[PDB]
Amino acid sequence: MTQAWLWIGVISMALGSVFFGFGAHNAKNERWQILYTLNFFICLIAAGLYLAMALGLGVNVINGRPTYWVRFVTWFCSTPLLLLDLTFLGRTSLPLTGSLLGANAYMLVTGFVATVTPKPMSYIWYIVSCAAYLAIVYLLAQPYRIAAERKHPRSKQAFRTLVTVHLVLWTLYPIVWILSPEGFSTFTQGSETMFYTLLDIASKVGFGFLSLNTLHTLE
Amino acid sequence: MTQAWLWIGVISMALGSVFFGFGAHNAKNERWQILYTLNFFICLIAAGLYLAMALGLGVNVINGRPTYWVRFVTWFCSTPLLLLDLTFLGRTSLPLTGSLLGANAYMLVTGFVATVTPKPMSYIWYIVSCAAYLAIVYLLAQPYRIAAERKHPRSKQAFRTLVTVHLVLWTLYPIVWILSPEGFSTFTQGSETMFYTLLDIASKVGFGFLSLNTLHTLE
Amino acid sequence: MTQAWLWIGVISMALGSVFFGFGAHNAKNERWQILYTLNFFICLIAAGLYLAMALGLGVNVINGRPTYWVRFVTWFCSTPLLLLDLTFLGRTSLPLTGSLLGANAYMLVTGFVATVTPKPMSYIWYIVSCAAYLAIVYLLAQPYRIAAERKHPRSKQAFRTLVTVHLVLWTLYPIVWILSPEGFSTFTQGSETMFYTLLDIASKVGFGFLSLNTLHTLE
Numbered sequence: 001m002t003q004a005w006l007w008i009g010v011i012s013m014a015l016g017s018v019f020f021g022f023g024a025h026n027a028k029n030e031r032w033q034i035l036y037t038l039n040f041f042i043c044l045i046a047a048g049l050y051l052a053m054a055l056g057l058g059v060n061v062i063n064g065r066p067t068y069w070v071r072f073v074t075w076f077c078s079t080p081l082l083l084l085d086l087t088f089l090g091r092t093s094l095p096l097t098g099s100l101l102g103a104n105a106y107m108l109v110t111g112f113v114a115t116v117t118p119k120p121m122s123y124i125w126y127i128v129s130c131a132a133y134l135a136i137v138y139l140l141a142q143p144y145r146i147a148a149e150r151k152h153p154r155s156k157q158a159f160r161t162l163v164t165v166h167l168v169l170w171t172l173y174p175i176v177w178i179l180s181p182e183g184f185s186t187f188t189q190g191s192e193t194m195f196y197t198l199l200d201i202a203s204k205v206g207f208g209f210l211s212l213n214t215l216h217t218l219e
Numbered sequence: 220m221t222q223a224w225l226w227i228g229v230i231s232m233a234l235g236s237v238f239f240g241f242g243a244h245n246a247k248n249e250r251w252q253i254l255y256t257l258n259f260f261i262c263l264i265a266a267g268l269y270l271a272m273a274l275g276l277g278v279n280v281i282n283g284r285p286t287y288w289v290r291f292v293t294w295f296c297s298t299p300l301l302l303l304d305l306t307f308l309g310r311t312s313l314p315l316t317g318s319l320l321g322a323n324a325y326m327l328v329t330g331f332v333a334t335v336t337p338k339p340m341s342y343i344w345y346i347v348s349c350a351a352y353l354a355i356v357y358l359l360a361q362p363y364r365i366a367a368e369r370k371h372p373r374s375k376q377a378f379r380t381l382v383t384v385h386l387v388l389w390t391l392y393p394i395v396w397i398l399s400p401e402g403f404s405t406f407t408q409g410s411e412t413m414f415y416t417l418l419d420i421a422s423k424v425g426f427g428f429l430s431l432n433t434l435h436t437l438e
Numbered sequence: 439m440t441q442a443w444l445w446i447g448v449i450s451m452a453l454g455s456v457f458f459g460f461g462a463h464n465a466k467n468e469r470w471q472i473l474y475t476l477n478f479f480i481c482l483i484a485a486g487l488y489l490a491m492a493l494g495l496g497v498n499v500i501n502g503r504p505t506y507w508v509r510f511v512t513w514f515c516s517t518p519l520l521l522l523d524l525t526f527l528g529r530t531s532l533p534l535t536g537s538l539l540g541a542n543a544y545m546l547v548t549g550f551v552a553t554v555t556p557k558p559m560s561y562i563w564y565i566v567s568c569a570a571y572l573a574i575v576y577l578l579a580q581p582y583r584i585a586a587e588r589k590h591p592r593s594k595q596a597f598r599t600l601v602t603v604h605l606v607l608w609t610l611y612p613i614v615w616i617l618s619p620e621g622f623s624t625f626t627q628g629s630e631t632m633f634y635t636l637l638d639i640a641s642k643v644g645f646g647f648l649s650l651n652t653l654h655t656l657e
C-alpha cells in the first residue's frame with residue numbers, strides 16, 4: 001500500500017537528515033561542512049515532503065485519480081541542491097551552474113503541467129519536459145565533465161561515477177511517469193508511489209553518500 | 220507470499236554457506252581462514268533459521284497474529300559473529316568487544332519481549348531495545364572507529380565503509396518492526412516477511428562479501 | 439503485473455543500448471570500442487526480447503501455464519557475449535573460450551527442455567542444466583581466474599570482482615526457475631516475470647557498467 005511506502009519514506013529521509021546533520025557538525029573543514037550541509041537540507045526537504053503526503057496533504061483528484069502535486073513543489077527545492085552537489089565538487093563556473101539549474105527548473109514546471117493536464121495534451125508537456133531533461137544529460141556529460149576532469153586530472157573516475165549514477169537515477173522518473181496512470185497506465189496508483197519512494201531515497205540518501213565518497217577520493 | 224520469501228531465504232543463506240565454506244577451505248593464511256569461517260557460520264545459522272520457518276516451525280499466534288519468535292533465537296547467535304567480523308578486522312581490544320556483544324545481547328532480549336507483549340506495553344520495550352541499539356551506534360562510530368583507524372592509517376576509508384554499511388543495514392530492522400503489525404501496522408504480515416528476508420540476506424551474505432573486500436584493502 | 443515489468447524491461451534495455459552505443463561511438467581505442475560494442479549488442483538483443491514478450495509474442499500455454507520460451511531463443515544469443523566480456527578482458531586463450539561457450543550452450547538447450555517438458559521429467563533436465571552451469575562455475579573460478587591474474591598481476595581484485603558478481607547474478611536464474619510454477623510453485627506467474635526482468639537488467643545493463651569499470655582499473 002501507498003501509506004506503507006510514504007511512511008517508509010518519512011523515516012528514510014529523516015534518518016538521512018540525522019546522519020548528514022551529525023556530519024555537518026564535527027566536520028573537518030569548510031569543503032566538508034558545505035557538502036554535509038547540502039545533503040542535510042536535501043534530506044530535510046524530502047522528509048518534509050513525505051511527512052505531508054503520509055498525512056494526506058498535497059494530494060487532490062486530477063482527471064479521476066489521486067495526484068501528489070506536492071512532489072513538484074518540493075522537487076523544485078531539493079533537485080537544484082542535488083545539482084549543486086555536482087557543481088560544488090567539480091568547482092564549476094557560475095554560467096554552467098546557471099544553465100543546469102535553468103534547464104532543471106524548466107523540466108519540473110513543464111513536468112508539473114503534464115501531471116495536472118488531461119490526455120492527450122499531457123503527452124506534449126511530457127515530451128517538452130524530457131527535452132529539458134535531455135538538455136541536462138548533455139550539460140553533465142560534456143561541459144561539466146570536461147571542466148571537472150581538467151581541474152582534477154588524477155580523479156577522472158570520480159566525476160565519471162558521479163554523472164553516470166546521476167544519469168541512471170534521474171532517467172527512471174520519466175520512465176515511472178509514462179508507465180503510471182499519467183501515461184500508458186501499465187501499473188496501479190500503488191506501484192507509482194512505491195517506485196517514486198525507492199527512486200527518491202536512492203536519489204537523495206544514496207547519492208548523498210556517493211558525493212561524500214567522491215570528496216574522499218579528491219582529498 | 221511469506222512462503223516464497225522464506226524459501227528464497229533458505230536457498231540464499233545455504234548458497235552463501237557453500238561460497239564462504241569453499242573460501243574457508245583453500246584459504247591463504249590464518250587471518251583469511253578465520254574471516255571466511257566467521258561468515259560461513261553466520262550463513263549456516265541463517266540457513267538453519269529459514270529452513271525451520273519455511274517448514275512452519277518457530278511460529279505461534281501471539282496477540283492475534285503469526286509471530287516468528289525463532290528470529291530472536293537465531294539472531295542471538297549470528298549477530299555477535301557479525302560484530303566479531305568488525306572487531307576481528309579492527310584488531311579491537313577485548314573490553315570493547317565485551318561492550319558491543321553486551322549491548323547487542325541486551326537489544327535482542329528486550330526486542331524479543333516487545334515482539335511477544337501486547338500493545339501499548341510493547342512500545343516501552345521497543346524504546347528500550349532502540350536505546351540498546353543507539354548504544355551500539357555510538358560504540359562503532361566512536362571507540363571502534365578511532366582504534367581501527369590508528370591501527371590502520373592508510374585504510375581509514377575501509378572501516379568508514381564497514382561501519383556506515385553496518386549502520387544503514389541494522390537500522391532498517393526497528394523501522395520494519397515499528398511499521399509492521401507489531402507497531403503502527405502500515406503493511407500486512409506478508410510484507411514483514413519479505414522485508415526481513417531481504418534485510419537478513421544483505422546483513423549476512425552482502426556484509427560477508429564486504430568484510431572480505433575490506434580485508435583485501437588492508438592486505 | 440507481468441505487463442508492467444515486461445515494459446519496464448523494454449525501456450531499460452533500450453536505454454542501456456543508447457548508453458553503450460554512444461560509448462561505442464567516440465571511443466578512445468580498439469580495446470574500448472570492442473567492449474562498448476559487445477555491451478551494445480547484448481542490450482539490443484535483450485530490448486528485442488522484451489519488445490516481443492510485451493506485445494504477446496514468444497509465449498504459449500505449456501502444461502497449463504503461460505510460458506515465454508522466447509527467453510531461451512534470445513538468452514542463446516546474449517549470454518555467449520556476456521562470457522565474451524569476461525574472456526576479452528582476461529585476454530583468455532581460445533580453447534578456454536570454446537569450453538565456456540560450449541558449457542553455456544548446453545545449459546540453455548537442456549534448460550529449455552526442462553521449461554517445455556511436464557513434471558517430474560522436467561526435474562531431470564533441470565538437474566542436467568544445473569550441472570552444465572556448475573561446469574561454468576568451475577571454469578570461471580579456476581582456469582579463467584588463474585590465467586587473467588598472471589596476465590594482470592596488479593589487478594587480481596578486478597577479475598575477483600568480475601567472477602563473483604557473475605556468479606551471484608547467474609545463480610539466481612535456476613533459483614527463480616525451481617521456485618516458480620516450473621518447479622515447486624512457491625510463487626505466481628507474475629512474480630516469475632518480475633524476478634526475471636530484475637535479474638536480466640542487472641545481468642546485462644548492470645554487468646555492462648561493471649566490465650567497463652573493470653577495464654578502467656586495467657588501464
Ligand SMILES: *C/C=C(C)/C=C/C=C(C)/C=C/C1=C(C)CCCC1(C)C
Pocket residue numbers: 075078079082107108110111112114125126129130133170171173174177200203204
Ligand atoms: C529527489 C527527486 C528527484 C531527483 C526528481 C527527479 C525528477 C525528474 C528528473 C523529472 C522527471 C519528469 C520528466 C523528465 C518527464 C515528465 C514527467 C517527470 C516530471 C516525472
Ligand SMILES: *C/C=C(C)/C=C/C=C(C)/C=C/C1=C(C)CCCC1(C)C
Pocket residue numbers: 294297298301326327329330331333344345348349352389390392393396419422423
Ligand atoms: C541477520 C540479522 C540481523 C543483523 C538482526 C538485526 C536486528 C536488530 C538490529 C534489532 C532490531 C530491533 C530494535 C532495535 C527495536 C525492537 C525491535 C527489533 C528487535 C526489530
Ligand SMILES: *C/C=C(C)/C=C/C=C(C)/C=C/C1=C(C)CCCC1(C)C
Pocket residue numbers: 513516517520545546548549550552563564567568571608609611612615638641642
Ligand atoms: C541475460 C540472461 C542471462 C544472463 C540468463 C541466465 C540463465 C541461466 C544462467 C540459466 C539458468 C537455468 C539452470 C542452470 C537450470 C534450469 C533452468 C534455467 C534455464 C533457468
Ligand SMILES: CCCCCCCC/C=C\CCCCCCCC(=O)O
Pocket residue numbers: 101102103105106109110113116117
Ligand atoms: C529558469 C527557468 C524557470 C522556469 C520557467 C518555467 C517556464 C514556464 C512555461 C510554461 C508552463 C505553463 C505555466 C503553468 C500553468 C499550468 C496551469 C495548470 O496548473 O494547469
Ligand SMILES: CCCCCCCC/C=C\CCCCCCCC(=O)O
Pocket residue numbers: 130133134171174175178184185186445449
Ligand atoms: C498498453 C500500453 C502499452 C505501453 C507502451 C509503453 C511503450 C514505452 C513508450 C515510451 C517510453 C518513453 C521513453 C522513455 C523516456 C525517455 C526520456 C529520456 O530520458 O530521454
Ligand SMILES: CCCCCCCC/C=C\CCCCCCCC(=O)O
Pocket residue numbers: 161165168169172195198199202209210213
Ligand atoms: C558509494 C560508492 C559506490 C558507487 C557505485 C554506485 C553503483 C550503484 C548505482 C546505481 C544502482 C541503483 C539503481 C537502482 C535504483 C533502485 C530504485 C528503483 O529503480 O526503483
Ligand SMILES: CCCCCCCC/C=C\CCCCCCCC(=O)O
Pocket residue numbers: 320321322324325328329332335336
Ligand atoms: C550481557 C547482556 C545479556 C542480556 C541480558 C538481557 C536482560 C534481560 C532483562 C529483561 C528482559 C525481561 C525478561 C524476558 C521475559 C519476558 C517474558 C515473555 O516471554 O513474555
Ligand SMILES: CCCCCCCC/C=C\CCCCCCCC(=O)O
Pocket residue numbers: 007011349352353390393394397403404405
Ligand atoms: C496509521 C499509523 C501511522 C504510522 C506512524 C509512523 C510514524 C513513524 C514513527 C516512529 C518511527 C520510529 C523511529 C525509527 C526507529 C529509530 C531507532 C534508531 O535506529 O535509533
Ligand SMILES: CCCCCCCC/C=C\CCCCCCCC(=O)O
Pocket residue numbers: 380384387388391414417418421428429432
Ligand atoms: C562490496 C564492496 C562495495 C561496498 C559498497 C556498499 C554500498 C551498498 C550498501 C548498502 C545499500 C543496500 C541497502 C538496501 C538494503 C536492501 C534490503 C531492504 O531494505 O529491504
Ligand SMILES: CCCCCCCC/C=C\CCCCCCCC(=O)O
Pocket residue numbers: 539540541543544547548551554555
Ligand atoms: C556445444 C554444445 C551445443 C548445445 C548442444 C545441446 C545438446 C542437446 C541435447 C539434448 C537436448 C534434447 C533436444 C531438445 C528437444 C526437446 C523437444 C521439445 O521441444 O520438447
Ligand SMILES: CCCCCCCC/C=C\CCCCCCCC(=O)O
Pocket residue numbers: 226230568571572609612613616622623624
Ligand atoms: C511446497 C514446496 C516446497 C519448496 C521446496 C523448495 C526447496 C528448495 C529445493 C531445491 C533448490 C534447488 C537448488 C538451487 C539450484 C542450485 C544450482 C547451482 O547454482 O548450482
Ligand SMILES: CCCCCCCC/C=C\CCCCCCCC(=O)O
Pocket residue numbers: 599603606607610633636637640647648651
Ligand atoms: C560498478 C562497480 C561496483 C562493483 C560492485 C558490485 C556489487 C553489487 C553486485 C551484486 C548485487 C546485486 C544482486 C541482486 C540482484 C537484484 C535482482 C534480483 O535478485 O531480483
Ligand SMILES: [Br-]
Pocket residue numbers: 045046049074075078
Ligand atoms: Br523533495
Ligand SMILES: [Br-]
Pocket residue numbers: 151152153154155218
Ligand atoms: Br585529482
Ligand SMILES: [Br-]
Pocket residue numbers: 264265268293294297
Ligand atoms: Br540468524
Ligand SMILES: [Br-]
Pocket residue numbers: 370371372373374437
Ligand atoms: Br593501513
